[PDB]
Enzyme design. Structure first.
Site, mmCIF file in Angstrom:
data_model
loop_
_atom_site.group_PDB
_atom_site.id
_atom_site.type_symbol
_atom_site.label_atom_id
_atom_site.label_comp_id
_atom_site.label_asym_id
_atom_site.label_seq_id
_atom_site.Cartn_x
_atom_site.Cartn_y
_atom_site.Cartn_z
ATOM 1 C CB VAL A 57 -1.063 0.041 1.058
ATOM 2 C CG1 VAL A 57 -2.040 1.109 0.662
ATOM 3 C CG2 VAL A 57 -1.781 -1.304 1.194
ATOM 4 C CE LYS A 64 -5.825 5.870 -7.157
ATOM 5 N NZ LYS A 64 -4.955 5.613 -8.315
ATOM 6 C CB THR A 93 -12.371 -10.789 -23.001
ATOM 7 O OG1 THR A 93 -11.172 -10.109 -23.297
ATOM 8 C CG2 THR A 93 -12.342 -11.506 -21.679
ATOM 9 C CB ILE A 98 -11.103 -13.278 -28.016
ATOM 10 C CG1 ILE A 98 -11.576 -13.545 -29.435
ATOM 11 C CG2 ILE A 98 -10.780 -11.800 -27.808
ATOM 12 C CD1 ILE A 98 -12.990 -13.028 -29.653
ATOM 13 C CB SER A 172 -16.067 -29.457 -9.405
ATOM 14 O OG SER A 172 -16.411 -29.276 -10.765
ATOM 15 C CG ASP A 182 -14.036 -27.207 -18.109
ATOM 16 O OD1 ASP A 182 -13.991 -27.759 -17.051
ATOM 17 O OD2 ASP A 182 -13.347 -26.151 -18.414
ATOM 18 C CG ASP A 184 -9.997 -30.968 -16.664
ATOM 19 O OD1 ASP A 184 -10.432 -29.951 -17.180
ATOM 20 O OD2 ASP A 184 -8.809 -31.101 -16.151
ATOM 21 C CG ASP A 248 -9.492 -29.415 -22.018
ATOM 22 O OD1 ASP A 248 -10.243 -29.080 -22.888
ATOM 23 O OD2 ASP A 248 -8.807 -28.570 -21.308
HETATM 24 MN MN LIG Z 1 -11.440 -26.515 -20.294
HETATM 25 MN MN LIG Z 2 -12.337 -28.069 -14.971
HETATM 26 NA NA NA Z 3 -11.578 -15.466 -24.269
#
Ligand SMILES: [Mn+2]
Ligand SMILES: [Mn+2]
Ligand code: NA
Ligand code: NA
Length: 327
Positions: A57, A64, A93, A98, A172, A182, A184, A248
């Site tokens: 800091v 701020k 994004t 991207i 998870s 997703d 894995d 993946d």
């Molecule tokens: Mn993934």
């Molecule tokens: Mn995952």
């Molecule tokens: Na992205």
DNA sequence: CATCTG
DNA sequence: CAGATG
């Protein structure tokens, strides 16, 4: 944990922006330690000068924090939340493929939206294209009820290809979780390890099978050990087709599966703690192995693991069912 | 860290 | 090859 939340939160908004809009990795990095420390901080920060007192800091942050304590707001934060450019970058994004880097170029070319993107499908690469094509599907969580069907497939097919394959769906999904982002899958084979000099087919054969049956729909990236794709559970009796899911698949030398599997299974917190305990117990643990810690400072030599069991044992600990691997 | 792009 | 993305 809630005592210095706003502060840690605004700090995070700021930090994020430096990095994503401007290029201020330093600054960016700046807000970051700041929130990190204030985050730990034991009292209710009542002022800037107080905070200032902390490491990380400085004067600008202090400033701020004051305006923020002073009023429920921060001008700069308000200025950024409006600004279309800043917004565009946070948005673009969202497309898989991207990053900020690219988000900048596009915006500067005037592509700021989903439509913009479609119209300029030319300027996007394969990954990005896919990312665009499945924008919606990709943002949708994955309900465990689908997960099981998915897992069901992959497992059966890997088996077909070679009985010696060993696959595991970490994440998870593995720790209980009702839904996931997703799929894995961790993979090994006896005939693949530490010294063993490659076997690409090992990973390419399965991918192929999965495509064969139409489970895997597209390729994001295919290397010799890591595969980034898109899959989809066969739409039953037409009326309800499924979303497109991210998936993946990674190859691992058998001599380091469990550590990997341990690791990917998480949670981050579980890891650390286990990690810390291993350390006490006179050990070392990372993504791939567990090593006996020498005293001269540090020291190596891969302890030999045949299961997730072998690991805990080493560090002498309670075998943890994945469910209770939470923290 | 591994893969891709250019 | 640097640099980007996940
Ligand atoms: Mn993934
Ligand atoms: Mn995952
Ligand atoms: Na992205
Ligand atoms: Na450089």
């Amino acid at each position: 944990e809630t005592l210095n939340g706003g502060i840690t939160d605004m700090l995070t908004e700021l930090a994020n922006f430096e990095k994503n809009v401007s290029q201020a990795i330093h600054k960016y990095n700046a807000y970051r330690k700041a929130a990190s420390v204030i985050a730990k901080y034991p009292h209710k920060i009542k002022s800037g000068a107080e905070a200032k007192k902390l490491p990380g800091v400085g004067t600008k942050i202090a400033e701020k924090i004051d305006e923020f304590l002073a009023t429920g707001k921060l001008r700069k934060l308000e200025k950024i939340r409006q600004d279309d450019t800043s917004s565009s970058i946070n948005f673009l994004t969202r497309v898989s493929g991207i990053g900020p880097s690219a988000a900048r170029k596009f915006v500067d070319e005037g592509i700021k939206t989903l439509e913009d993107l479609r119209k300029n499908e030319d300027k996007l690469n394969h990954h990005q294209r896919i990312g665009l094509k499945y924008f919606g599907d990709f943002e949708k969580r994955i309900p465990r009820e689908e997960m099981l069907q998915m897992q069901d497939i992959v497992l059966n097919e890997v088996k077909k290809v070679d009985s010696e394959y060993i696959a595991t769906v970490c994440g998870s999904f593995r720790r209980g979780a009702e839904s996931s982002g997703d799929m894995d899958v961790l993979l090994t084979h006896p005939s693949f390890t530490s010294e063993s000099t490659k076997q690409p087919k090992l990973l390419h054969q399965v991918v192929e099978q999965l495509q064969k049956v139409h489970f895997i729909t597209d390729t994001l990236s295919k290397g010799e050990t890591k595969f980034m794709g898109v899959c989809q559970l066969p739409s039953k009796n037409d009326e309800k087709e499924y979303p497109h899911r991210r998936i993946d698949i990674r190859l691992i030398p058998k001599d380091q599966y469990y550590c990997g599997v341990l690791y990917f299974t998480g949670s981050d917190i579980f890891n650390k703690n286990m990690r810390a305990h291993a350390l006490e117990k006179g050990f070392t643990i990372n993504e791939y192995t567990i090593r006996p810690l020498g005293v001269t400072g540090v020291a190596g030599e891969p302890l030999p693991v045949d299961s997730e069991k072998d690991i805990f044992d080493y560090i002498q600990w309670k075998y943890r069912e994945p469910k209770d691997r939470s923290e």
